[PDB]
Design a protein around this motif. Structure first.
Motif, short mmCIF file in Angstrom:
data_model
loop_
_atom_site.label_atom_id
_atom_site.label_comp_id
_atom_site.label_asym_id
_atom_site.label_seq_id
_atom_site.Cartn_x
_atom_site.Cartn_y
_atom_site.Cartn_z
N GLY A 211 0.75 -1.24 0.00
CA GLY A 211 0.00 0.00 0.00
C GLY A 211 0.78 1.30 0.00
O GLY A 211 0.19 2.36 0.14
N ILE A 212 2.10 1.22 -0.16
CA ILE A 212 2.94 2.41 -0.17
C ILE A 212 3.25 2.88 -1.59
O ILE A 212 3.91 2.18 -2.37
N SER A 213 2.83 4.10 -1.89
CA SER A 213 3.04 4.70 -3.20
C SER A 213 4.52 4.98 -3.47
O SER A 213 5.33 5.14 -2.56
N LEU A 214 4.85 5.12 -4.75
CA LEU A 214 6.22 5.41 -5.15
C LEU A 214 6.66 6.77 -4.61
O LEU A 214 7.81 6.93 -4.17
N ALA A 215 5.75 7.76 -4.60
CA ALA A 215 6.06 9.10 -4.10
C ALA A 215 6.52 9.05 -2.64
O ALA A 215 7.45 9.77 -2.26
N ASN A 216 5.90 8.18 -1.86
CA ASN A 216 6.26 7.98 -0.46
C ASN A 216 7.68 7.41 -0.35
O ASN A 216 8.46 7.88 0.48
N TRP A 217 8.01 6.43 -1.18
CA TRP A 217 9.36 5.86 -1.15
C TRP A 217 10.39 6.90 -1.56
O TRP A 217 11.50 6.92 -1.01
N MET A 218 10.05 7.73 -2.55
CA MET A 218 10.94 8.78 -3.02
C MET A 218 11.18 9.80 -1.90
O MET A 218 12.30 10.26 -1.69
N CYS A 219 10.10 10.19 -1.23
CA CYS A 219 10.20 11.16 -0.15
C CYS A 219 11.09 10.58 0.95
O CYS A 219 11.93 11.30 1.50
N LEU A 220 10.97 9.27 1.17
CA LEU A 220 11.78 8.58 2.18
C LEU A 220 13.26 8.65 1.84
O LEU A 220 14.08 9.10 2.66
N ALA A 221 13.61 8.23 0.62
CA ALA A 221 15.00 8.22 0.16
C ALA A 221 15.59 9.63 0.11
O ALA A 221 16.77 9.82 0.39
N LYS A 222 14.76 10.61 -0.26
CA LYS A 222 15.19 12.00 -0.33
C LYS A 222 15.61 12.50 1.05
O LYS A 222 16.70 13.03 1.22
N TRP A 223 14.74 12.33 2.03
CA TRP A 223 15.06 12.79 3.37
C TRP A 223 16.04 11.93 4.15
O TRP A 223 16.72 12.41 5.07
N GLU A 224 16.15 10.66 3.78
CA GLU A 224 17.07 9.78 4.47
C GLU A 224 18.52 9.94 4.03
O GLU A 224 19.42 10.07 4.86
N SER A 225 18.73 10.00 2.71
CA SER A 225 20.08 10.07 2.15
C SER A 225 20.31 11.10 1.05
O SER A 225 21.44 11.26 0.58
N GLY A 226 19.25 11.77 0.60
CA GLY A 226 19.40 12.71 -0.50
C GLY A 226 19.63 11.91 -1.78
O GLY A 226 20.25 12.40 -2.74
N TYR A 227 19.14 10.68 -1.78
CA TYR A 227 19.27 9.74 -2.92
C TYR A 227 20.71 9.20 -3.06
O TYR A 227 21.11 8.80 -4.15
N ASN A 228 21.47 9.18 -1.96
CA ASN A 228 22.86 8.70 -1.96
C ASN A 228 22.96 7.29 -1.40
O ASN A 228 22.75 7.07 -0.20
N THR A 229 23.33 6.34 -2.26
CA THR A 229 23.47 4.94 -1.88
C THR A 229 24.63 4.67 -0.91
O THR A 229 24.63 3.65 -0.23
N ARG A 230 25.60 5.57 -0.86
CA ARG A 230 26.76 5.41 0.02
C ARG A 230 26.61 6.11 1.37
O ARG A 230 27.54 6.13 2.20
N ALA A 231 25.45 6.71 1.59
CA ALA A 231 25.15 7.44 2.82
C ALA A 231 25.27 6.53 4.06
O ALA A 231 24.83 5.37 4.03
N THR A 232 25.91 7.03 5.11
CA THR A 232 26.07 6.28 6.37
C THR A 232 25.99 7.24 7.53
O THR A 232 26.49 8.37 7.46
N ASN A 233 25.41 6.76 8.63
CA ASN A 233 25.29 7.58 9.82
C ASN A 233 25.53 6.71 11.05
O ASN A 233 24.82 5.73 11.27
N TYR A 234 26.56 7.04 11.81
CA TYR A 234 26.87 6.28 13.01
C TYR A 234 26.10 6.91 14.17
O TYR A 234 26.09 8.13 14.33
N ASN A 235 25.47 6.07 14.98
CA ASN A 235 24.71 6.53 16.13
C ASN A 235 25.54 6.17 17.35
O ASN A 235 25.50 5.03 17.82
N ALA A 236 26.30 7.13 17.85
CA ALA A 236 27.17 6.91 19.01
C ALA A 236 26.38 6.47 20.23
O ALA A 236 26.87 5.69 21.03
N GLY A 237 25.14 6.92 20.32
CA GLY A 237 24.29 6.57 21.45
C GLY A 237 24.10 5.08 21.66
O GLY A 237 24.21 4.60 22.79
#
Length: 130
Positions: A22-48
């Motif tokens: 039930g998830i539209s393509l626009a939703n997935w795009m919005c997700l990838a945009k805000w998560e990585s800016g569409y960057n497959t090499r994006a990484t974030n370490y959570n020191a916590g």
């Protein structure tokens, strides 16, 4: 690899993401945009909690992929976190599908709730032929 908007839209569509659980393509795009800016090499370490977010969807090592350095973690997608850093997003899409098969659905990602839920996401797929 940093995807261009429409390029990613069709890549996701070919991978079966349009309306998946039930998830539209626009939703997935919005997700990838805000998560990585569409960057497959994006990484974030959570020191916590000593976990790391990987790839275009920033999937976390505590539960989804194995990087061998996250305390008490599991690997629900049954993938080395390395697979989430490839230019080819097939494995990341397969893992993203695994994520949403759970009770929360697309809500699993807090950034989706913060920047996509109840927002006009149409702009993400306009003109992409999807």
């Amino acid at each position: 690899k940093n995807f261009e908007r429409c390029e990613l839209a069709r890549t996701l569509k070919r991978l079966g993401m349009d309306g998946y659980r039930g998830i539209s393509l626009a939703n997935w795009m919005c997700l990838a945009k805000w998560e990585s800016g569409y960057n497959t090499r994006a990484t974030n370490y959570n020191a916590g909690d000593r976990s790391t977010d990987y790839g275009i969807f920033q999937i976390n090592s505590r539960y989804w992929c194995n990087d061998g350095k996250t305390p008490g973690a599991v690997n629900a997608c049954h993938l080395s976190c390395s697979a989430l850093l490839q230019d080819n997003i097939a494995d990341a899409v397969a893992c993203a599908k695994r994520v949403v098969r759970d009770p929360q659905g697309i809500r699993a990602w807090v950034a989706w709730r913060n920047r996509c839920q109840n927002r006009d996401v149409r702009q993400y797929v306009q003109g992409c032929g999807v």
